[PDB]
Design an enzyme around this catalytic site. Structure first.
Site, mmCIF file in Angstrom:
data_model
loop_
_atom_site.group_PDB
_atom_site.id
_atom_site.type_symbol
_atom_site.label_atom_id
_atom_site.label_comp_id
_atom_site.label_asym_id
_atom_site.label_seq_id
_atom_site.Cartn_x
_atom_site.Cartn_y
_atom_site.Cartn_z
ATOM 1 N N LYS A 177 0.914 -1.270 -0.028
ATOM 2 C CA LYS A 177 0.154 -0.032 0.052
ATOM 3 C C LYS A 177 0.797 1.383 0.087
ATOM 4 O O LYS A 177 0.612 2.222 -0.902
ATOM 5 C CB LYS A 177 -0.862 0.032 1.184
ATOM 6 C CG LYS A 177 -1.398 1.422 1.671
ATOM 7 C CD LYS A 177 -2.334 1.884 0.437
ATOM 8 C CE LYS A 177 -2.725 3.255 0.587
ATOM 9 N NZ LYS A 177 -3.592 3.729 -0.306
ATOM 10 N N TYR A 211 15.304 -8.539 9.913
ATOM 11 C CA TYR A 211 14.904 -9.454 9.126
ATOM 12 C C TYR A 211 14.444 -10.905 9.623
ATOM 13 O O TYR A 211 15.248 -11.293 10.298
ATOM 14 C CB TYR A 211 15.866 -9.714 7.907
ATOM 15 C CG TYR A 211 15.637 -10.936 7.210
ATOM 16 C CD1 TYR A 211 14.634 -11.101 6.395
ATOM 17 C CD2 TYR A 211 16.969 -11.864 7.012
ATOM 18 C CE1 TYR A 211 14.267 -12.235 5.488
ATOM 19 C CE2 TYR A 211 16.526 -13.081 6.152
ATOM 20 C CZ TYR A 211 15.421 -13.391 5.553
ATOM 21 O OH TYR A 211 15.363 -14.450 4.853
ATOM 22 N N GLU A 256 -1.061 -10.847 9.786
ATOM 23 C CA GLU A 256 -0.416 -10.472 8.830
ATOM 24 C C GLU A 256 0.773 -9.748 9.174
ATOM 25 O O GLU A 256 1.930 -9.595 8.822
ATOM 26 C CB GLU A 256 -0.954 -9.107 8.068
ATOM 27 C CG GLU A 256 -2.497 -9.984 7.329
ATOM 28 C CD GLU A 256 -3.634 -9.564 8.190
ATOM 29 O OE1 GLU A 256 -4.352 -8.618 8.017
ATOM 30 O OE2 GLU A 256 -3.896 -10.586 8.938
ATOM 31 N N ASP A 274 4.210 -4.861 13.529
ATOM 32 C CA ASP A 274 3.537 -3.716 13.130
ATOM 33 C C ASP A 274 3.989 -2.663 13.966
ATOM 34 O O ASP A 274 4.540 -3.012 15.158
ATOM 35 C CB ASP A 274 1.892 -4.059 13.276
ATOM 36 C CG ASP A 274 1.522 -3.934 14.618
ATOM 37 O OD1 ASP A 274 0.409 -3.648 14.778
ATOM 38 O OD2 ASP A 274 2.312 -4.068 15.603
ATOM 39 N N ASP A 304 -4.826 -2.974 17.939
ATOM 40 C CA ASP A 304 -5.133 -4.267 17.362
ATOM 41 C C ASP A 304 -3.835 -5.005 16.831
ATOM 42 O O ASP A 304 -3.041 -4.592 16.162
ATOM 43 C CB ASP A 304 -6.241 -4.213 16.374
ATOM 44 C CG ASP A 304 -5.908 -3.630 15.096
ATOM 45 O OD1 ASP A 304 -6.393 -3.908 13.828
ATOM 46 O OD2 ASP A 304 -4.999 -2.512 15.418
ATOM 47 N N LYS A 306 12.344 -1.373 4.394
ATOM 48 C CA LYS A 306 10.916 -1.179 4.090
ATOM 49 C C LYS A 306 10.728 0.367 3.467
ATOM 50 O O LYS A 306 11.257 1.231 4.078
ATOM 51 C CB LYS A 306 9.882 -1.192 5.338
ATOM 52 C CG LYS A 306 8.467 -0.756 4.959
ATOM 53 C CD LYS A 306 7.645 -0.879 6.083
ATOM 54 C CE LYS A 306 6.234 -0.895 5.953
ATOM 55 N NZ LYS A 306 5.431 -2.186 6.123
HETATM 56 C C1 P9J Z 1 10.252 -6.354 7.750
HETATM 57 C C2 P9J Z 1 10.378 -7.899 7.616
HETATM 58 C C3 P9J Z 1 9.782 -8.944 6.902
HETATM 59 C C4 P9J Z 1 10.659 -9.790 6.733
HETATM 60 N N1 P9J Z 1 10.373 -11.105 6.192
HETATM 61 C C5 P9J Z 1 9.279 -11.365 5.366
HETATM 62 N N2 P9J Z 1 8.335 -10.386 5.142
HETATM 63 N N3 P9J Z 1 7.235 -10.998 4.432
HETATM 64 C C6 P9J Z 1 6.472 -9.745 4.297
HETATM 65 C C7 P9J Z 1 5.263 -10.175 3.740
HETATM 66 C C8 P9J Z 1 4.368 -9.143 3.386
HETATM 67 C C9 P9J Z 1 4.557 -7.895 3.684
HETATM 68 C C10 P9J Z 1 5.796 -7.461 4.332
HETATM 69 C C11 P9J Z 1 6.662 -8.456 4.604
HETATM 70 C C12 P9J Z 1 7.299 -12.030 3.843
HETATM 71 O O1 P9J Z 1 6.506 -12.386 3.156
HETATM 72 C C13 P9J Z 1 8.088 -13.029 4.094
HETATM 73 C C14 P9J Z 1 8.287 -14.276 3.645
HETATM 74 C C15 P9J Z 1 9.156 -15.220 3.731
HETATM 75 C C16 P9J Z 1 10.339 -14.745 4.550
HETATM 76 C C17 P9J Z 1 10.530 -13.484 5.306
HETATM 77 C C18 P9J Z 1 9.379 -12.607 4.755
HETATM 78 N N4 P9J Z 1 11.626 -9.555 7.665
HETATM 79 N N5 P9J Z 1 11.523 -8.444 7.987
#
Ligand code: P9J
Length: 249
Positions: A18, A87, A135, A149, A131, A37
């Protein structure tokens, strides 16, 4: 301590949404692996959220817990804002749920415990959370959950408590009740096909259990979802709950 985009090598996109997507990244000098991000400035002001971010970012930078995703820093350029994040290699709890369809009592009680602890710690410092959605829950290398979050202060609307929809410090108990239910059942207790119905169900606290949910779970879940904030347990009480202590790692 000022960061710039050329300080990092950007990797594969981890996910989108978004405002901006999230990329895997490695800091060039230290070779340190993290998540970057990316948020587009224009898209932020146009939500009147730009100030909201500043305060949340300030807040997060000061939170240190194993179950809370770490925020290392931030920066911006002419166009956009960048958050430097811990991460989490195993992805979201949301996606794990999609893959498994539901969790057993042992996984549920463990996650709830990790959450409960993370929320206790926040309360220790007079930080309260809004909340909490699946996700926004990530998983560390050891499969430990991390609240990712930015939703602090000093979900529309499956995860919102009655107080927030009708018009705290007790919100988080309600959140645990929704998550605990969702983990075992596979969908949140107030789910409906329209915003309007969901709103009704939450305000009335109207939900039922499938047959497979055990007595112990029903007992904990029923204690946490109470229209009245004051009837909800303390985090301490949750951590000691017999169904919790018996099933949790
Ligand atoms: C901020 C962060 C994310 C992350 N790892 C991951 N993030 N997000 C994700 C999905 C949707 C929206 C935002 C993040 C993932 O799908 C994901 C999938 C497999 C392994 C690691 C991650 N590590 N640190």
């Amino acid at each position: 301590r000022q960061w710039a985009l050329e300080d990092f090598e950007i990797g594969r996109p981890l996910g989108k949404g978004k405002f901006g997507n999230v990329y895997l990244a490695r800091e060039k000098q230290s070779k340190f692996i993290l998540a970057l991000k990316v948020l587009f400035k224009a898209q932020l002001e146009k939500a009147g959220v730009e100030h909201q971010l500043r305060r949340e970012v300030e807040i997060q930078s000061h939170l240190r817990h194993p179950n809370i995703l770490r925020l290392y820093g931030y920066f911006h350029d002419a166009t956009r804002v960048y958050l430097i994040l811990e991460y989490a290699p195993l992805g979201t709890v949301y996606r794990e749920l999609q893959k498994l369809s539901k969790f057993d009592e042992q996984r549920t009680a463990t996650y709830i415990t990790e959450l409960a602890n993370a929320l206790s710690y926040c309360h220790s410092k007079r930080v309260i959370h809004r909340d909490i959605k699946p996700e926004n829950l990530l998983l560390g290398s050891a499969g430990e959950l991390k609240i990712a979050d930015f939703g602090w202060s000093v979900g529309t609307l499956d995860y919102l408590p009655p107080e927030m929809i009708e018009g705290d410090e007790k919100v988080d108990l309600w959140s645990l009740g929704v998550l605990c239910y969702e983990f075992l059942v596979g969908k949140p207790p107030f789910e409906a096909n329209t915003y309007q119905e969901t709103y009704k169900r939450i305000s009335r606290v109207e939900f039922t259990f499938p047959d497979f949910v055990t007595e112990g779970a029903r007992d904990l879940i029923s204690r946490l979802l109470k229209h009245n904030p004051s009837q909800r347990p303390m985090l301490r009480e949750v951590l000691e709950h017999p169904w919790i202590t018996a099933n949790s790692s």
